[PDB]
């Protein structure tokens, strides 16, 4: 049997980056040729491994994480990066062994009146550890006084909404991302 990569890339709905989705891939023959031979991908950078030489490598588990961010924020999905996404939504380790794949999805994830279904975490006291998934909705206490779960001054909703409209610049249109994590065996080529 073959690995369910077609489920991830050709998925109908993608998750918001703060609540990024994780698929655990195991016990399957992985055909990586379907990916690096595709001309529909705008970003495809691999770390600690070669793209063409992956059908010759065995790993214990493969992790595919998928979410939606801004095109401006694709540069942050990489080891040693900082930013509103890398710090507070999805963080890669410095010793990352895997590949980051992205492509524009303005035709799907932008509505005429503005798509607000895709969100990103804007407020957090400290940075995320590698592969940390923070889905908290607690009101952010930016001031001296406590919030008690009520919004107001110095008490803000920690998430912010992307305004995905078709008229947006390249950097502001939605991009769908899939992060493959190779862990070292049940997934080979």
């Amino acid at each position: 049997n073959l690995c369910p990569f077609g489920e991830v890339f050709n998925a109908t709905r993608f998750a918001s980056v703060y609540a990024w989705n994780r698929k655990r891939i195991s016990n399957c023959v992985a055909d990586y040729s379907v990916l690096y031979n595709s001309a529909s991908f705008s970003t495809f950078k691999c770390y600690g491994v070669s793209p063409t030489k992956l059908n010759d490598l065995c790993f214990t588990n493969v992790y595919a994480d998928s979410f939606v961010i801004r095109g401006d924020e694709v540069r942050q999905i990489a080891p040693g990066q900082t930013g509103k996404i890398a710090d507070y939504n999805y963080k890669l380790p410095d010793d990352f062994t895997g590949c980051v794949i992205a492509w524009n999805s303005n035709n799907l994830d932008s509505k005429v009146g503005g798509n607000y279904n895709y969100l990103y975490r804007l407020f957090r006291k400290s940075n995320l550890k590698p592969f940390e998934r923070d889905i908290s909705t607690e009101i952010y206490q930016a001031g001296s006084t406590p919030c008690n779960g009520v919004e107001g001054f110095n008490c803000y909703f920690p998430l912010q909404s992307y305004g995905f409209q078709p008229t947006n610049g390249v950097g502001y249109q939605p991009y769908r991302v899939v992060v493959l994590s190779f862990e070292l065996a049940t997934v080979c080529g």
Partner: antibody
Framework: EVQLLESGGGLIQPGGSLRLSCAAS????????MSWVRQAPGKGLEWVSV???????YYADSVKGRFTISRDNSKNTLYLQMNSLRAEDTAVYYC???????????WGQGTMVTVSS | AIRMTQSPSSLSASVGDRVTITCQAS??????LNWYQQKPGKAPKLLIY???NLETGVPSRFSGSGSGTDFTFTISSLQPEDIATYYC?????????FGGGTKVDIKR
């Protein structure tokens, strides 16, 4: 009420150093986005540095490697360490709680840094 | 790095005249553009945030519109205390960049 008070500006020889303190009241510095913005005499505004809520620091190209930004949670104070100062660093230095949402944008009153001999 | 261009550099208008200044962005900055009023000697004061939204406490005579790359800042009826230098800034994309400024004088 809520206000930003800053100090530390004055005369300093070129190549010297100078730290600017920005004391806050009404909010937590370690929890907000803070920014330094300088205005040369007669000129426009120039963004300098930013510290995020999580701690990530960013600097302008003209001061990168020379200026440093930090904060003290116990004192609720924003700092700006300036090293290898040049004559073109002479300006008023405003510290500001960066605008992120409706009504949180607040600016200091600036201190005059005069780099001369 | 983005470069904001602000026209006009200087301006003089009568009390009550409609005053409009523009700020064109070098790249797309969506609507992440703010407007500041800097009276002489004092610090800049945020008037319009996110291109068109009025900060709490600003008089209604201050207006803003625009998205993408071209924006406008409108004073409905100019008042004597409105004399200042007005700047535009983008902040979503780093580094943060300002406009050249617009000095406004009253024609009395």
């Amino acid at each position: 009420e809520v206000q930003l008070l800053e100090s530390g500006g004055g005369l300093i020889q070129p190549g010297g150093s100078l730290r600017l303190s920005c004391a806050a009241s009404g909010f937590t510095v370690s929890s907000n986005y803070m920014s330094w913005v300088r205005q040369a005499p007669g000129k426009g505004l120039e963004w300098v540095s930013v510290i995020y809520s999580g701690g990530s620091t960013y600097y302008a190209d003209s001061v990168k490697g020379r200026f440093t930004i930090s904060r003290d949670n116990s004192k609720n104070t924003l700092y700006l360490q300036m090293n290898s100062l040049r004559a073109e660093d002479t300006a008023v230095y405003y510290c500001a709680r960066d605008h992120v949402r409706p009504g949180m944008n607040i600016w200091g009153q600036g201190t005059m840094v005069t780099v001369s001999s | 790095a983005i470069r904001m261009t602000q026209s006009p550099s200087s301006l003089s208008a009568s009390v009550g005249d409609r005053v409009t200044i523009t700020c064109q962005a070098s790249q797309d900055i969506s609507n992440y553009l703010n407007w500041y009023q800097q009276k002489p000697g004092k610090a800049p004061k945020l008037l319009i945030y996110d291109a068109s939204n009025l900060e709490t406490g600003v008089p209604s005579r201050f207006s803003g519109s625009g998205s993408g790359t071209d924006f406008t800042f409108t004073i409905s009826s100019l008042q004597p205390e409105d004399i200042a230098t007005y700047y535009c800034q983008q902040y979503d994309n780093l580094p943060v960049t300002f406009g050249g400024g617009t000095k406004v004088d009253i024609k009395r």
